[model samples]
Target: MSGLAKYLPGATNLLSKSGEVSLGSLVGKTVFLYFSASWCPPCRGFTPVLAEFYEKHHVAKNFEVVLISWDENESDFHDYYGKMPWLALPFDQRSTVSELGKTFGVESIPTLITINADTGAIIGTQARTRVIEDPDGANFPWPN
Candidate 1:
């Protein structure tokens, strides 16, 4: 029932496994689309904040997140994902599906997008800001 099907149109899995896991598993949950990269100092600053929030509410909310890489190379990409607990688009697919960013008009770094996987709609655009302001996730994205 996740609205993510529309939000992530071409994110379907084609291979049994790519660099790590598959996104298809996220089909029925809400999602946080996190855009990250080391090059963006702001991105590094925001991650820990988001991680902390996710750590507390992720499973509690039946939620998921996809770390989209802005890292230009493989090593940096791998290194970053390992630093977090959420799922990520493999380094190779970052380019192959580069439009993921474009699809959202990713005009900035360290951006967080909230899309309802079951509802098939974006809950918010300034999730990064909301994450910082709303630490409790009380009204975050929505109650249901």
Candidate 2:
């Protein structure tokens, strides 16, 4: 397990296209907990922006994003996740999702939290806004 192993209690392994992926895979990476839903207009709009940034730097910077989706519909969850090149919690892990919501104090959609994957150190919480303002992630993993 990565240092973030404590963050998701019920999440032994996260969802990937082929199958389950271990949290240990995230070690030594800068991780982002991305909270959003396909049903939200703002999230739909913002996802493209994030995806662009993710695609650009993931390989070089060892960055990774994990989707903590709010889509209970399951299909929509898969539908949306299909568009993202990232890991995500399983649809059945509702408990873990809510726990994450409470732990992060996420009151709204499109909230993102940044952390150092190897150390589990939170780097920033206002990441959605930072992504917008710093479109190209000029100073990525921007410290809080």
Candidate 3:
């Protein structure tokens, strides 16, 4: 069991293609856990927005995105997002996914969560407009 905090919920079940990773590794940074599935329309729509943001902002110190997969299978995850630009929890790790969502009070898909890794405090709902309007913000490299 993991300690469900108003902030940090702990590691996830999804293993990376490389294998398990330590939650402690992500400490000392702001962790953005993006809970999504390939089958979801909203997720498909929003992922690119997030990708752009990551390209522009993830390089900053103490910034990282933790993708929590909700896809039905490895193929599904791969088929849908074989080329994503960020790290994801392994699709096979279900316990972490289930427990983490429950701990975080997640009841829906396309949910974007932000956590202050330094303090283990969970931020509120991600702003859709913020993602869409300024995905790269001032440093966004995509074409205007």
RMSD of each: 3.6, 1.5, 5.6
lDDT of 3 by residue, 15-118 (tens): 34455556666656666778888878888778887777777777763466667788888898877656676667666666678877887767887776767655
Sorted on TM-score, best first, the list reads 2, 1, 3
**Once superposed on the true structure, which residue ranges of model 3 sit more than 4 Å away at CA?**
1-21, 127-129, 133-144
Between candidates 1 and 2, the one scoring higher on TM-score is 2
Ranking by lDDT: 2, 1, 3
TM-score for candidate 1, residues paired by index: 0.82
Number of the top TM-score candidate: 2
Question: Candidate 1 on 46-129: residue-level lDDT in tens?
Answer: 998888988999888778778777887989887777778877766667554467677777887888778876666767778888
Q: After superposition, how far is residue 33 of candidate 2 from its true place, in Å?
A: 0.7
Give lDDT per model, in order: 0.72, 0.86, 0.64
Work out how many backbone clashes candidate 2 has: 0
Worst 10 residues of 2 by lDDT: 1-10
| Residue 101, model 3: Cα distance from true site in angstroms | 2.0
Which structure among the candidates has the greatest lDDT?
Answer: 2
Superposing every Cα of model 3 onto the true structure, what RMSD results?
A: 5.6
Q: In model 2, state the lDDT of residue 19.
A: 77
